């Protein structure tokens, strides 16, 4: 939000401001594997384009890092029981770069909607070809804690790296989506090897009920719909536990 | 409670019937959801058997597991005035008669039927 | 969130060290890192007891 | 309603009661099958809570959830006749009172009552 | 049908109930136990729908589907006795009238009544 | 259970991944459910549903075999986990149609 | 403490009971989950030997290798009153005696006691 | 309970107490095979923590986790009389006192003392 | 015993309190030792069973799994004064009275109390 003036100039004060508070469009140059499978993308025979090319081209408002489709706790069902299949075009976006866990007030998103759709919709006023609908979503966050117990007997390289899939794994997690503990536990095995002790624990900050959130007997965390996990804290207990035992 | 612990309200869901009346707002009134991925809990079944048993055990009968239309029995013999135990002692004037009066099933004591048919 | 490169020296007593491993781009999130370290100079000088 | 949308007929199954009134076939009774491995529809527990819960909440109770045996309760309130309410004017000749007669749960006018003491 | 076939007894786990008065002792209190991926098993939910239909059914009234308080009315018609039909003849001496007597629901004779009512 | 939707290409992958797992697998060494979930969750991704489920063929009991409380398959030594045939099947509707 | 440090609740596990009042919330309530895989912590398992051990020595008695029941021991010395020590000095002021006063077990005093005797 | 549920008898293992009163065959007393593939269930562990959880908090103490005497010092309280409250009504005459009586610990009513006393 | 067979003494872990006294050299205060490669030996826990269970036992109270609070019903009963029973026959001048005496709860014999109430 706040910078300063590198070169002086007579008569301006060097403090300066961020209009905004962002600074957007940053990216790197394209690599070789990812070019070719986005190339063998556009010839190969895709149902539902429209749904694909609308997430292409609504990862091109600044700022947006990730867009995901409606997760699977986001279907639903008529007093019959059967699927229903959605006529509209929806989805989520992630600005995991400018808020918190990336998740954007409802401005931002209906401004991206008004923008990708038009006003009012399917009018081919906007991106969108005509008689194309939709709506661009958002979530809510939900602050889970993470807790990893048997790990001070790793090497520290183990323990870090560790640590860090845990947290990248959680931060990318799609709006509705269930944080099960086979994941966890999964991107640790992965790395401590197939007989190394390792538990984790999902629970709430101050054991509060937070809307939006169940946890299943096996100890994973149910989500709804609208709302993504969010990393609160990692933390290990190494309560001294070695391999010398000193 | 026989509630879904993180169900929707009645007029989000089908089939719920709202207008229940809970004692205090720690246990609302909450249905299961409809979405695919909505499993019965276990717990809310046990709470519904449970509260079926204690009905069932009413006015001393016993369950059987082998037939089944035990709650008809008990609810027939609700209805079954016949089968209100007899009374040892003397009615005094104190008691109470239950009757349909002007349209309505309430009671009326001895004392206002022996100054009624008194006039 | 820090910037660390591989020039990184350490000065024990009155011995110097240098990273083993690959140092990491980053200084993890908690603030703390564990670095495996080897002597600059061989023989039995880079003993030490520090 | 509280049956299964997609059941079988209940000669088909087990557990089932036949003999079931309902109004007309468009509410027929089915039940799950026995046969390929089918989960309980959350739809049709949000209609057995409902009608539990309605039946709780007559008589004017409200449901509660820290104890299990609310309709054994209500039941309770059903066939004790000195729960119902007094009634304020004075019976008067044209009202039913209640009574077992000849083994029927029936009910007679004061004017009968009175022709018999009178008599 | 009911009391799941593979299931706990009271405190081994959670909402359950006891004192469940059973006929014989192959027909257990039992509960669906609280671990993880137990599911309810379609055949208990056919008891227990059988065991709601025939409440519902008791008493001669017919099932609805687009009404989820029928256990409710029928509760009611099982109060309310002033939808029990009337005495068709006329009564006699033995017969029994329901009461409120020291504070308990009982019956007395025709006969005590009378020979209170002419004292 | 719930393989069918996912493009053929992964359920061939699975399924070669399964049949070798279970083939190769030491004598008197349980065949636990959660080997086998994490055998999907390599290709399948993390927002797939995806259950595993072990059973003896036609419920039969089998000399040297029990069920542990979580499914898994416990095997008494001097005994080795051989593949009848896996077989794929859903059960749980989604959206992955339309 | 003796609750295994990355736990979990009650109402998400078996055989846990919670309702245990702790200084604070850095000793909470946790317990193992309702897994197959994990294993118990010796740390814990010192936790537990060092409590029973710690109430074993209790009373000045020594634990003993034999002795499977040592702990009994410990209770019975515990609740047998005969086996304190003869008060090696005489009685006076008001030295309060135990007993089970209006119901509930409690002391009262010398003078208190004379009081009744003395009239 | 706290025994292991696949376990074998007292007399087929070591350190296991023989004669332990269950309340019944639901509840069997076995403990952990020797053998070798065998570890300490989580399961069964939470019933032992569970149980010292309990008793440390009996008498309205609370848990500390940073001591490890805790069953030692509410043994201490459960054995220490004064510990006991003291009490403010008067002993009426149908109150208890305890002591040696023939080197048994019981009580006795204030009649047999004040009736002792004159003498 | 209930310590481990090759572990540690107190200083040398965690969780381990000393100041133990055990009868000679023999099964001394030894606790698991903090390697990551030790798991519980299952023996021990076969002991530390026995000790719990033959602490409920205790008073000839008999021990259910289904509950997870007999060992605080245990000390309760152990505080609970009004448990002594009755004193089957009349006391006499050599018998001994429970109480605390300035601190230093002991036993009271009825001559002194006697002759210090004859005063």
Redesign the interface.
């Known amino acids: 939000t706040d910078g300063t003036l590198v070169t002086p100039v007579p008569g301006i004060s060097s403090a300066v401001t961020a209009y905004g508070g962002n600074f957007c469009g940053g990216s790197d140059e394209e690599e070789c594997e990812q070019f070719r499978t986005r190339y063998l993308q556009r010839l190969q025979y895709q149902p539902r384009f429209t749904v694909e090319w609308l997430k292409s081209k609504a990862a091109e408002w600044p700022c947006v890092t990730d867009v995901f489709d409606l997760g699977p706790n986001c279907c639903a069902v008529n007093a019959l029981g059967e699927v229903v299949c959605p006529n509209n075009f929806e989805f989520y976006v992630l600005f995991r770069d400018t808020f918190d866990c990336g998740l954007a007030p409802q401005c931002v998103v209906d401004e991206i909607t008004d923008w990708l759709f038009g006003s009012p919709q399917g009018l081919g006023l906007g991106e969108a070809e005509f008689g194309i609908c939709g709506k661009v979503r958002t979530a809510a966050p939900v602050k889970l804690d993470i807790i990893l117990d048997g790990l001070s007997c790793a090497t520290?390289?183990q323990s870090?790296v560790v640590?860090?899939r845990v947290?990248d794994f959680v931060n990318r997690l799609p709006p509705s989506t269930n944080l099960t503990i086979d994941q966890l536990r999964f991107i640790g095995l992965q790395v401590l090897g197939p007989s190394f002790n390792f538990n984790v624990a999902i629970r709430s900050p101050n054991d509060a009920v937070q809307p939006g959130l169940r946890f299943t007997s096996c100890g994973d965390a149910e989500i709804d719909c609208d709302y993504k996990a969010c990393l609160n804290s990692v933390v290990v207990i190494n309560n001294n536990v070695t391999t010398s035992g000193c | 409670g026989i509630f879904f612990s993180g169900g929707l309200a009645c007029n989000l869901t089908v089939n719920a019937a709202c207008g229940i009346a809970t004692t205090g707002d720690d246990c609302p009134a909450l249905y299961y959801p409809p979405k695919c991925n909505v499993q019965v809990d276990p717990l809310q079944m046990n709470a519904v058997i449970s509260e079926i048993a204690n009905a069932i055990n009413a006015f001393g009968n016993t369950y059987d597991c082998s037939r089944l239309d035990n709650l008809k029995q008990v609810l027939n013999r609700a209805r079954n005035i016949c089968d209100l135990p007899p009374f040892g002692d003397a009615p005094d004037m104190d008691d109470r008669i239950a009757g349909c009066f002007d349209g309505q099933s309430s009671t009326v004591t001895v004392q206002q039927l022996v100054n009624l048919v008194l006039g | 969130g820090s910037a660390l490169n591989q020039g990184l020296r350490f000065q024990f007593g009155n011995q110097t060290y240098e990273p083993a491993?690959v140092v990491?781009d980053q200084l993890?999130?908690?603030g703390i890192?564990?670095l495996?370290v080897s002597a600059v100079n061989p023989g039995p000088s880079g003993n030490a007891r520090v």
């Open positions: 520290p390289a870090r640590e860090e947290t | 491993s990491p993890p999130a908690t890192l564990v495996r």
